[PDB]
Subunit: 337 residues, 4 copies
């Protein structure tokens, strides 16, 4: 609990580097080994300088075998195959699989061998033989015997605590979700052939409102079984480089008022789910450690006839909120065995 | 040929002038703003979002010359003090944002003033509110002050009408993901109107903001009065917006029925598309609302349905197209 | 009427096609690109920076119907197997990138192929570089393959040439304040190219970057070889750029002389303006370069002068427009 | 502990306040602006470009509490009417933009007023204009009104001073690629100041604009008087800027010498770097100026040299860091 889990990161892209950054400020968790195929000098620079998350809090120098991050050495390997990483050499109990390739059960568990690691957390959905965990919503399902788990998506970690609070208090019949989302790496900087064939993600990301699909509301059942098949949604990608907001319009079993809804969210608040009545904007949530931040100023309960539509809304940094939730799950999972 | 005056040569005003060049039977002979003719002539010629002007503009003393024809410019702060009649001006496009009630808009009507006024915004409940090809039939021609509604109203109305006529609307909640506007601050600072969100850098944030378009839809479609509410998320595009509506309907429907209904309701004001477009693709369109079949949802859970419908609009040109159709028609029954 | 083939339907190819619709006496009868035609058709119809396609585009078997006329759209990987002569194609705009040398580009030349080729890339010593209305007099017509230079070269060249011809250039440094481009990451990440600056979010940063358009000006203006160097600052506009040249000249000058000289050098490729414009005003212009007299500076300190001289260009449509001109002309000689 | 007034709680005002929390012996006891406490308290807590406030801010009657300690807020439009003396205020940060001359700034000095004024801007040619760690030695403590110069002057001066000291400057032209600021319109509209370029949408354009910093360098470095001129290109980032200087020198140099000379001159105000950084990397820095060795060019052509040196600055936090340093020093010698 104050015990410091030694952590490996595989793939030092956006999620890896931010996971690293987050881990400096949540100790009782420590990265001793990074693995990635790109030039360590390219990697050091991108750890140091970050457009949206700011300059690194400290110092980063390239040394033989790794980095000195504020004095402390950290090993950087470039082993292509997960089977070939001697994690146990550097005390590494658990691995954050963040490449984007090794995202099934049988691929990720190649990290497990006598010189490898005990456990693995994947940064995508794993399917349905790999448990899916949003911290402080459904992390109770972990018994400790599991070899590989998933941290869900950025959108799922925002929606989950907000949806869970609606279910436990009032009961959700059905709901539709709209995420107003920062542009992401899967969009073209300028109009051009998207190698996925998506005609919308082919368009200039920082110059357009771009509608896009998302499976977060449809696959919410993996995290909250009571809402399986009850939620659907979509996204509007807009020109901010990070920071997002999720609106849920739902029909509930119980009658409610705005005040009841907000107070129920305030009472559900914890390290993962924040609360605020400050009329904030997206730039204010960049770098937060909440997985989701409910905003009471945007709540609506529309009673027309007997019938009620309820609008809820929660902010999230699709980068750092997600990262923070992932580090929370990576800590807890390593501390059961 | 009806002679039109524009009070407020801003985004809506300047673009109304641009459209009026292609409307035979309507002509602008007076502009009133707060600035010199050279500022206004420059801003007509060059437009960041809507492109270079189609023609010639040259500055003169007391006005400017658009393709040879002189148009008078004045900088009178007060509506009552504008001598519209001097220039032959019968109808005024009130496009400043400051005289958007019946009382205030009527100051334009006096001796040597104008006969009639079209507000480019909600004008309160005691002004008639016209979305062209939805409720422009309600005009007899004896009105002094009418409203052309808001931009978001002109998007939502034909879409919500189509849902009501075909299926019946129980209730509904609207989100408009909307371009930033001139009432937002370019960088964080004191908002004169007290808004803590519009005080923030408009091109660097997703900014929640309130909107009355759904709440006041009763003024355009009486049968929907009290049934719709909503809000906005202002985002970093300089123009171009989209309206999502989530609704419970009286009749059970499918995605295909809903889209076909919309296509059938299509006209000059209400577009239909199945192309998966983005906001830049609607900049400068002449529809007041462009329905997008690619974003329609119909979610059935335990026999109950939620219906999602989405229409694009250029908050600038889409509104302005509607405004000028409503002007053209209002002039011809005056 | 010159029948044209476009090998590579990326930003350039697509705009070349769009341009060619309006400068007729030049026509596109065959497009060849390995991308799914439905993606290509969609990108032709809708363009973020250059607006909607002027016309209609529908995907048909083997090609597109663009406003009535059918255009064949093949996906030949190899240049020697495109049967250009089956669609009357005289001249090929090589815009793929893969076939940028002479011997690669001239595989388009065979009995069932084309007669001539214009690469969009910079040639390899034995391929002539051509800015239209600057050095297109060097083309005798016997050449098989030529280059149309870069976007920046097409902006700089007519401005530098007028400096040389009127005054004489000793040396110079160039800075381009440039739209972000497709070789920049949308968000911070590892980049093919290795550039730690192009690895950064392009629409959220000022990003210094290297250019050789000044260093390679010798190829277009022999008198300026070795005399100009430069660099760029990529900034958050999706298209539109501006080129600043600070030069020592052989002759003493005034700001008025400099400006009237540029005005005298004006033509279809080199525009001249005295309006205080901004980048959005040059989006989609057909000039290769647009001299801005309002930014001219001549700083006399002691006996000595530094002359600052500035030009706008749509790094997209300006370069494209210059490339369709070169393409038209090179075809009409044989 | 000297007690300080801020007039204008804007970008510079609020960041100055922020920096003063960590400066022992300086303390803000009064803020004056044109709006209520809740607006100002909100804009302090939440900052788009500079992040959340480091502390607690709570609104009260007549002011707000910052980590417990109360700060009075008034809304007095005229400097002559502000009773600074009531709150112990001796020195005023004149940060509104509207009282930026010796004469206008002096209106804070009266019975019940303040003792001394620091303008957060150029204040004309009869006022001591200080760039900290370049010429703050000129302050004796008897001055009533001083200027902290402009953002761009605080960037340019240490770079130009090292060039003078080590090698001697003949003449020089400056281009600053600059963030947009609050004097630009968020969308195309009449600019109150009459500037036809600042009228344009600032987050959607490259906007040329004038700047007096280069010409006024004589106030800070007398030996460079009349030798420097420049201009700006305002571009779509909300903060962060960079200054390119092209100079002919008296001594011949190499790239290596030039960079070594900058690193020698390095201090708390003048940073030195060799990392290929971009504008977001300098947001929030405490350096007034940050030299970038990677962009140094020395071009030699026929014996003759043009030298290019480039320094970064957060027009917001870099200037403010410089301003508060000058404020801290001025207050100690008063
Ligand atoms: N831009 C949109 O998206 C949009 C859409 C629909 C409706 N509207 C409405 O249209 C109106 C104008 O909006 P806009 O976006 O064009 O704003 P804008 O700021 O571009 O235009 C306002 C213009 O009015 C001028 N002005 C202000 N006070 C004046 C006075 N007393 N006399 C004369 N001129 C004066 C200003 O100088 C400016 O040119 C508002 O009511 C707004 O709600 C705007
Ligand atoms: N922002 C920059 O990058 C920057 C850098 C260096 C210097 N400056 C200079 O600093 C000054 C302020 O710039 P800013 O960007 O902070 O502007 P800003 O618009 O953010 O702030 C101006 C503030 O002054 C207030 N104000 C206006 N008139 C007033 C009055 N009569 N009394 C009291 N308050 C009044 C406004 O409400 C606002 O809060 C200007 O002189 C500017 O040139 C700005
Ligand atoms: Mg007409
Ligand atoms: Mg203090």
């Amino acid at each position: 609990s104050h015990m410091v889990v030694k952590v490996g990161i595989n793939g030092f892209g956006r999620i890896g580097r931010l996971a690293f950054r987050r881990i400096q400020n949540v100790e009782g968790v420590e990265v001793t080994r990074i693995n990635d195929l790109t030039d360590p000098n390219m990697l050091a620079h991108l750890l140091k300088y970050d457009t949206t998350q700011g300059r690194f809090d400290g110092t980063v120098e390239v040394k033989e075998g790794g980095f000195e991050v504020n004095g402390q050495f950290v090993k950087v390997s470039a082993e292509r195959e997960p089977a070939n990483i001697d994690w146990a050499t550097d005390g590494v109990e658990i691995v954050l699989e963040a490449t984007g390739f090794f995202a099934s059960k049988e691929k990720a568990e190649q990290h497990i061998h006598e010189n490898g690691a005990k456990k693995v957390v994947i940064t995508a959905p794993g399917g349905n033989d790999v448990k899916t965990v949003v911290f402080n919503t459904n992390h109770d399902i972990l018994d400790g015997t599991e070899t590989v788990i998933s941290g869900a998506s950025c959108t799922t970690n925002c929606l989950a605590p907000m949806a869970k609070a609606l279910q436990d208090n009032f009961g959700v019949k059905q709901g539709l979700m709209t995420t107003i989302h920062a542009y992401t790496g899967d969009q073209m900087i300028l109009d051009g052939p998207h190698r996925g064939g998506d005609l919308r993600r082919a368009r200039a990301g920082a110059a357009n409102i771009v509608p896009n699909s998302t499976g977060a509301a449809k696959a919410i059942g993996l995290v909250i079984p009571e809402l399986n098949g009850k939620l659907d949604g979509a996204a509007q990608r807009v020109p901010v480089p990070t920071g997002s907001v999720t609106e849920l319009v739902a029909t509930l079993e119980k009658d409610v008022t705005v005040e009841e809804v907000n107070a129920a969210m305030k009472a559900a608040a914890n390290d993962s789910y924040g609360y605020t009545e400050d009329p904030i904007v997206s730039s204010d949530i960049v770098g937060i450690s909440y997985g989701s931040l409910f905003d009471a100023t945007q709540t609506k309960v529309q009673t027309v006839d007997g019938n009620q539509l309820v609008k809820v809304v929660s902010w999230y940094d699709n980068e750092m909120s997600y990262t923070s939730q992932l580090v929370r799950t990576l800590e807890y999972f390593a501390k059961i065995a």
